[model samples]
Target: VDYIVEYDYDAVHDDELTIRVGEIIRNVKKLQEEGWLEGELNGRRGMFPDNFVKEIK
Candidate 1:
């Protein structure tokens, strides 16, 4: 049997967002490398790879 896993992220803005994104990226990369990033976000979900995504600062 299979179960659904849910998660709830957070929201951030300004410099904070930038910082969080960086940290998150590291985590994402690690998870992806380990082949464990296809379920759901952890800790927070709102502030995901798009929470405060930017092109240029």
Candidate 2:
């Protein structure tokens, strides 16, 4: 799993990271078909919605 953060998303859940625009989210793992993604952000690991991010090549 590989990708980058394309937008700033405020997490509604404590398990999610408060990602900022241009942040590099690494080791991304697709959690469910419902649009959840697990990744590492700012040294923390969490889950975020797929609509909140864009996939990198």
Candidate 3:
């Protein structure tokens, strides 16, 4: 998936990345139906979020 982080989100679980705004998260994979997403960013691979991260297309 191609998406841009729209807002910062704290990691609720260790599996989730403490995501920040403006960073482009690559290799995204949808984890759940409720806005959960896994991706690679900041040289680390973990789960972030698609809650507000806008799609590239």
Candidate 4:
């Protein structure tokens, strides 16, 4: 699935990502254990909170 960032967020860890509002996130896959979604933005790969984005159908 894909998503669009609703607001800018700073990464809390090296495994996480910093995203900006209006950025496109592609190929998001849920990581159930961590409660985050793995995806790519601007060619960078990392995990981010699901609440931070809106799904793009």
- Which candidate achieves the best TM-score against the true structure? 4
Residue pairs in collision within model 2: none
Model 2: per-residue Cα lDDT over 1-57, one tens digit each: 656777778888899877777877888889865777888988899887787777777
Clashes of each: 4, 0, 0, 0
Tens-digit per-residue lDDT, 1-57, candidate 3 = 777889998888878877788888887778865788878877777787677577678
Estimated TM-score for each candidate: 0.18, 0.80, 0.80, 0.85
Candidate 3 accuracy as lDDT: 0.78
Looking at model 3, the pairs that clash are none
Model 4 is weakest, by summed lDDT over 10 consecutive residues, at 27-36
- Better by lDDT, candidate 4 or 1: 4
lDDT of 1: 0.27
The sequence of per-residue lDDT tens digits that candidate 1 reaches over residues 1-57 is 111222232435422212333333322221222312321233332223332332221
- RMSD to the hidden true structure, all candidates: 13.3, 1.5, 1.5, 1.4
Off by more than 4 A, model 4: none
Instruction: Rank candidates by TM-score, best first.
Output: 4, 2, 3, 1
